[PDB]
């Protein structure tokens, strides 16, 4: 069906009406999203079908039609934009400076913007418009707010 590069909404008709479960990125004929959005299930794009190709529950990432294509990374210094696609609302760029998730296996960038869980899969961008990661996997802080990591896959 629609294979054009860009940001897409991931929807379902299983619940009441049409519900937005997440968001994803189409790039180089590959659909990239977060694992918790689709659970590895097949996707529909008009009359066409997207079958999963690669996935990992720990990284919380999944690619459809081909291997993960997104290889840009946050430089640890400059501001980024969350191209947020919220349920029932238009795509919107939100500029912020990322924080840090300090882990036993290294540091990761983190965006502190509050959006519904259906916004999961929204791409985080660098100044050149390159996707440096996906929004939707993080932690809940002392004030109920969500702080997501900048989750990036590995390009082979």
């Amino acid at each position: 069906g629609e294979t054009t590069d860009g940001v897409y909404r991931v929807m379902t008709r299983r619940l009441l009406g049409s519900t937005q479960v997440g968001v994803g990125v189409m790039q180089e004929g590959v659909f990239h999203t977060m694992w918790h959005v689709t659970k590895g299930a097949a996707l529909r794009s008009g009359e066409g079908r997207l079958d999963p190709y690669w996935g990992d529950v720990k990284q919380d990432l999944v690619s459809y039609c081909g291997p993960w294509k997104l290889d840009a990374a946050w430089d640890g210094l400059s501001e980024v934009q969350l191209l947020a696609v919220p349920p029932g609302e238009r795509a919107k760029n939100i500029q912020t400076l990322p924080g840090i998730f300090k882990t036993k296996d290294g540091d990761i960038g983190a965006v502190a913007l509050d959006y519904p869980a259906g916004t999961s899969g929204s791409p985080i961008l660098d100044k050149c418009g390159r996707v440096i990661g996906l929004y939707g996997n993080g932690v809940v802080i002392k004030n109920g707010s969500y702080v997501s990591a900048i989750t990036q896959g590995k390009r082979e």
Binding site: E2, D56, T96, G99, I100, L125, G129
Partner: protein, 39 residues
């Protein structure tokens, strides 16, 4: 059955709404891909 709908282009927007803080947090990632706070 899940489906996809195009929502726009992937572009950087100059003069976008600039908001949000930059916190430094101690986290742990489990086998299920869930993050948790370490103190």
């Amino acid at each position: 059955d899940m489906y996809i709908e195009r929502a726009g282009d992937i572009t950087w927007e100059k003069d976008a709404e600039v908001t949000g803080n930059s916190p430094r947090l101690d986290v742990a990632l489990d086998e299920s891909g869930d993050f948790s706070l370490v103190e």
